[PDB]
Each structure stands twice: as C-alpha cells, then as structure tokens.
Design a protein around this ligand. Structure first.
Ligand code: LW8
Ligand code: CA
Ligand code: MG
Ligand code: NI
Length: 145
C-alpha cells in the first residue's frame, strides 16, 4: 500500500495526493484495466489505464470527496445539466482536479493508453450510477465498491 495519514483527506489534500503520486512512478509503474494502490478506512487510490471506448457513465461518489490526476494522455470530465446539454472539459496530462461529495460527473473520451490516478476520501465504498429509461426518467442505483 501507500503510507498515508490515518484520517480523512479533504479535496485539496486529495489533489495534492494524486499529483505527488504522479511524481513517484515507483508507486504505480508496475501496475501499468485498473489497479488499487491503497485501500484503508480513510483513503482509496486507484490507477486507471484507459481505452478509447471507456466510459464511467454518470455517477456520484455518495459521501466521498475525490481528486483526479491525468498522468499520460487526456480525458473528458463531463458535468450534467438539466436541460441535457452537458458540459465537457478536456483534462490533459499533468493536469488535475478535485471535487466534494456532491459531485456528479462522467469520465470518457480518453486518449487510448491514457493513465490517471484517482483518490477518494472517505473511501469509495458506495457509488451512485444514474440511468435513463425509455421515457427519459432518471434513476440512481447505489452500487457497493
Ligand atoms: C477503479 N474502480 C474502482 C473500479 C472505479 C473507479 C472510477 C473510475 N472512474 C471514476 S470517476 N471512478 C471504476 O473504474 O469504476
Ligand atoms: Ca497518450
Ligand atoms: Mg516531492
Ligand atoms: Ni467519479
């Protein structure tokens, strides 16, 4: 695992975490499709390797805050809008962002071979996945992780 604090990390601390981890390839190069780098009572960290078709779908992280750092490549951070015309932001290698627990988003459109580091605190034990039925009606399925 990683040698992290024995407490929850907030948004800025998770962002610091994913960015410093990207600077320490000894922590993750071997795991270069996902690999856990660390799971305890306070923090989850994953390494994700992306194919072009990968798509998280729309989801929240329940009570988890989180942060993402793109190590190689680029992907789209998408935010949902009620009208239906969703925001898309390309996040490129070297760049990172963070979010509190109210965040709903979707990650897709990755460059093939992209690599990112994701950290969540409290741990990512539940995730809400949104879906739309035939009539356009939205639901949230809470998934254990
Ligand atoms: C690696 N993982 C735990 C299996 C998750 C984590 C995840 C990927 N993207 C976002 S946002 N969260 C996933 O790939 O769904
Ligand atoms: Ca690339
Ligand atoms: Mg350093
Ligand atoms: Ni997410």
């Amino acid at each position: 695992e990683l040698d992290l604090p024995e407490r929850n990390l907030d948004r800025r601390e998770l962002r610091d975490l994913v960015n410093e981890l990207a600077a320490h390839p000894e922590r993750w190069a071997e795991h270069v499709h996902y690999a856990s780098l660390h799971r305890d009572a306070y923090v989850d960290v994953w390494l994700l390797c992306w194919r072009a078709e990968d798509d998280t779908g729309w989801h929240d992280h329940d009570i988890s805050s989180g942060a993402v750092r793109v190590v190689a490549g680029a992907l789209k951070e998408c935010n949902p809008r009620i009208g239906g015309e969703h925001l898309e932001t390309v996040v490129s290698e070297g760049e990172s962002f963070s979010f509190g627990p109210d965040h709903i988003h979707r990650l897709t459109g990755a460059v093939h071979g992209s690599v990112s580091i994701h950290a969540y605190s409290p741990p990512l034990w539940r995730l809400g996945q949104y879906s739309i039925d035939d009539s356009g009606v939205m639901r949230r399925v809470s998934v254990s992780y």
